[PDB]
Amino acid sequence: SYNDELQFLEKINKNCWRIKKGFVPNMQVEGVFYVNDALEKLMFEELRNACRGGGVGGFLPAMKQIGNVAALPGIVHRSIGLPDVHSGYGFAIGNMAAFDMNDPEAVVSPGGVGFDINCGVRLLRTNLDESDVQPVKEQLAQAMFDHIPVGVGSKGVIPMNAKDLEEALEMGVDWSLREGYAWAEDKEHCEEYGRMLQADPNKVSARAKKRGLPQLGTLGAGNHYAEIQVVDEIFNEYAAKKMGIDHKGQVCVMIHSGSRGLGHQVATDALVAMEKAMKRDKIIVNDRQLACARIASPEGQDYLKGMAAAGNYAWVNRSSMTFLTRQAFAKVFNTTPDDLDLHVIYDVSHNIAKVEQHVVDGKERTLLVHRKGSTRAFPPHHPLIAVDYQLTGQPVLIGGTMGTCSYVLTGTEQGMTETFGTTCHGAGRYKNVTDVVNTCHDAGISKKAIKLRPIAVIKG
Amino acid sequence: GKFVVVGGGIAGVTCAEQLATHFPSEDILLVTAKRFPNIKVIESGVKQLKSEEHCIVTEDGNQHVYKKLCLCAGAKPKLICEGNPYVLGIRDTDSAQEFQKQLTKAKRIMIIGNGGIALELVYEIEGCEVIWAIKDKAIGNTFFDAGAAEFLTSKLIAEKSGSALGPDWHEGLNLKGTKEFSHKIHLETMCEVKKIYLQDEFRILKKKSFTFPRDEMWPVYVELTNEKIYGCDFIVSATGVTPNVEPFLHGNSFDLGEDGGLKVDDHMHTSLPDIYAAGDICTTSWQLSPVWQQMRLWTQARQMGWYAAKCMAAASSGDSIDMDFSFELFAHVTKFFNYKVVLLGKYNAQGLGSDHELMLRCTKGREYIKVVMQNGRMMGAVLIGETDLEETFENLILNQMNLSSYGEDLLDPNIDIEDYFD
Ligand SMILES: Cc1cc2c(cc1C)N(C[C@H](O)[C@H](O)[C@H](O)COP(=O)(O)OP(=O)(O)OC[C@H]1O[C@@H](n3cnc4c(N)ncnc43)[C@H](O)[C@@H]1O)c1[nH]c(=O)[nH]c(=O)c1N2
Ligand SMILES: NC(=O)c1ccc[n+]([C@@H]2O[C@H](COP(=O)([O-])OP(=O)(O)OC[C@H]3O[C@@H](n4cnc5c(N)ncnc54)[C@H](O)[C@@H]3O)[C@@H](O)[C@H]2O)c1
Ligand SMILES: [Mg+2]
Ligand SMILES: [Mg+2]
């Protein structure tokens, strides 16, 4: 009953709620959901609607999905739902879960990465104002659609070979920079310099490689798009100056894309191997969708090796899409891409697992943070982040849809201590981008630095 | 000696391009009637392959010797009756200009066919009365189900918003009729052309033309298989398309499919030694995967020409090459009545036989989505409208995830299934 489920749920603070242990049959640690007054009403309605449904099959309510992740072996900190939390296979979308790599009973969940791997966004600054582009916006749009392949069944213009694909899967952005499709400044302003050192191309399945060879350099269907935008507002002028947004109406472009086919095949290959291992190593899980393997077990190592490869492939795809975007601007505004100042503000991923150093229970541990729908947001003085943002804080790029304005944020110390530096990715395809970002700022897990409005969308 | 590819069609040019990239030290000849100077163009049409002597002769009388030959001669328009000046069928840019000229001078034009050419023309042309007669019960039987026809046909009532032509020849010409009345159209179901009567034949027999279809002495009158007879200034017969096998089949014993194409194996070999084929001329005889099928098009031709070049390169290197992933799942993304149409796998549940189920979610004048699931696993789906879910449906088909637990809610409006399987 709805009033029975309610007993497990209480309010921690004005913008966060708790899921007490026992909400699901086993729970290692409590759950938490981060909400504004508005997006909270929707998060509770999902649970109540599921309760009225007798014996409801599939599409379980997001709050129950947070709890089933809290049942997993090795969860070290609160299973936390970011504002974009919504129904997702296995782990709820927006969920961070962290597991200690030194604990012997641990878990890697494919649903805690996603079916894609390394879906992300790469914003690029440009010296042109909205008045330079507005009279030619249709020419620039056609030049972009001509230069950038889009949609299902599409094939990339950039030549791709099996050897070069294996190199890109093992080598990430370094491969694109070496080829000539990226610049040394692109390597700097990129999450982990766009590199996964644990990637093994020999782990990726042959079917995943077959899907990868032709799809490289293509956006695809779904929420993968490239969009041209203009700066609306500057909430942190120092951050804007640091990233090269000097004034409102400056042009920028967002490239949202990830692993195309290779990721889905790698993820689905993992779920099949995990079903065998869950019976073998007695990993007991509250939902069949939540596949799980011990990190020590070959299945956990294999998916983590595969995830890193698909991340390197996805980063190469983003760099290729960037290369094509620069060429389209260069033709339309009739000059060299560098003279138009097409440098990159940042590149960041919303569907990856990573090993990170966090101090938990007063003692630092190496944890695997599973985040899907969640973007990294490391604190203002974190040693790993770009030198330019080593003072302001790692940029978080938050992507809209349907002409809703996008936002660029930065990472905070409170967000590091509470969420392990985890923030929203974007609005559900009724919880607006604006609501979601205002909560992440109001809860002190992000600091809005820029706002941006789309003018041209290069979807499929 | 030199590799030879026949046809300036998408299959031939893409085969020649890829083959030139695989062997940059040797020349390729694209016979037909730059970025790779390795490919030369002969600009003539062959009359006879000579498979025993490994030779080709063109209309020039030039003789050529092939180490490998890819046949991509495309396909002739089939016609209701060849030789009549009032029948038209679109084939090539010359025929599109002829259609432009005739159309820019005329009214009361009939179209016969429920295939792709007719589906474009009824939306592209305005300012002529379009009489539509189709052998099937509803529009688009080749590309759509009955429920799909009802969505796209309700759009028909509303106002408009030497290689063969590819995905979009309709942009490169202006097609306005003299009447200037936008989308005035009538559809006649189950009908076929009985006979074509010129004005003189009509005057002799003293038969009466049926009145103009609604809610004058024309040049030609066409009788339907029903009791209604109609006149026109000319008639567009789509009639489908037949592979151009006729000039090649003479003198060599090629194995031909039920569609009359050259049968090709999994490595695209034509059942004659050293000879390959791709695009409309070929017919797929290898063991089809459950969610693939061969329909003549620009996308499949491009893919087949690539695979043929890869397979030819494999045989010269002696290496073994596996089948390309484009043959694992059929997908066609296209426009009909200004609506995106993505058909994935067995979109019309073709070949599923008795075992199949249908789940449909549609909003009137917005989008139509249908899902074909043979055993709780998605064999195919029909996607129509502005929906961007085509990658998700593609992935669920090639995974064969057991969706049975997700039940009927796999298409509920409030759940972001695209985000769920991103
Ligand atoms: C009006 C119209 C409209 C459409 C389409 C076709 C037509 C006619 N299609 C179908 C598509 O255009 C076509 O099926 C493919 O381009 C097939 O191309 P091929 O590789 O077979 O060459 P193609 O069929 O174009 O081959 C023609 C060439 O063959 C060569 N040739 C012919 N006879 C020869 C001989 N005897 N000797 C030597 N060479 C010879 C000549 O060089 C000629 O130029 C389509 N597809 C799609 O995906 N979307 C769409 O919207 C449409 N729409
Ligand atoms: N976007 C697209 O899908 C598109 C558009 C145009 C053309 N094309 C392709 O180009 C090729 C040529 O187009 P098409 O429409 O000629 O091919 P098609 O195979 O789609 O047309 C076959 C149609 O011809 C009709 N037909 C055949 N003989 C008939 C007869 N005697 N009387 C009445 N109807 C008869 C059938 O009922 C059927 O509807 C096809 O492969 C087609 O798929 C693609
Ligand atoms: Mg994404
Ligand atoms: Mg994605």
Author numbering:
A (entry chain A): 4 to 432, 475 to 505
B (entry chain B): 11 to 43, 75 to 202, 232 to 285, 294 to 500
Sentences copied from the publication:
To visualize the interaction between RTCB and PYROXD1, we reconstituted the RTCB–PYROXD1 complex in the presence of NADH and Mg2+ ions and analyzed it using single-particle cryo-EM. To overcome the orientation bias of the particles, two datasets were acquired using samples prepared in the presence and absence of octyl-beta-glucoside and combined to yield a molecular reconstruction of the RTCB–PYROXD1 complex at a resolution of 3.3 Å. The resulting model comprises a single molecule of RTCB and PYROXD1, indicating that RTCB and PYROXD1 interact with a 1:1 stoichiometry. The interaction involves the C-terminal domain (CTD) of PYROXD1, whose function has hitherto remained unclear, and the active-site cleft of RTCB, spanning an extensive interface with a buried surface area of 1,715 Å2. The molecular reconstruction shows clear densities for the nicotinamide and flavin dinucleotides within the active center of PYROXD1. Based on the kinetics of NADH oxidation and the dependence of RTCB–PYROXD1 interaction on NAD(P)H, we infer that the PYROXD1 is in the CTC state (that is, bound to NAD+–FADH−) when it interacts with RTCB. As in other flavoprotein oxidoreductases22–27, the ligands are positioned by PYROXD1 such that the flavin ring of the FADH− molecule stacks with the nicotinamide ring of NAD+, forming a π–π interaction. The structure of the RTCB–PYROXD1 complex reveals that the PYROXD1 CTD engages with the catalytic cleft of RTCB, thereby blocking the substrate binding sites and rendering the catalytic center inaccessible. The C-terminal tail is structurally disordered in free PYROXD1 but adopts an alpha-helical conformation upon interaction with RTCB, as it inserts into the catalytic center of RTCB and forms hydrophobic interactions with RTCB through Ile493, Ile495, Tyr498 and Phe499 of PYROXD1. Furthermore, the C-terminal helix of PYROXD1 contacts RTCB by hydrogen bonding interactions of the C-terminal carboxylate group with the backbone amide group of Phe118 of RTCB, while the side chain of the C-terminal residue (Asp500 of PYROXD1) coordinates one of the two Mg2+ ions (position B) in the RTCB catalytic center.
The metazoan tRNA ligase complex (tRNA-LC) has essential roles in tRNA biogenesis and unfolded protein response. Its catalytic subunit RTCB contains a conserved active-site cysteine that is susceptible to metal ion-induced oxidative inactivation. To preserve the function of RTCB under aerobic conditions, the tRNA-LC relies on the flavin adenine dinucleotide (FAD)-containing oxidoreductase PYROXD1 to protect its catalytic center from oxidation. Here, we report a cryogenic electron microscopic structure of the human RTCB–PYROXD1 complex, revealing that PYROXD1 directly interacts with the catalytic center of RTCB through its carboxy-terminal tail.
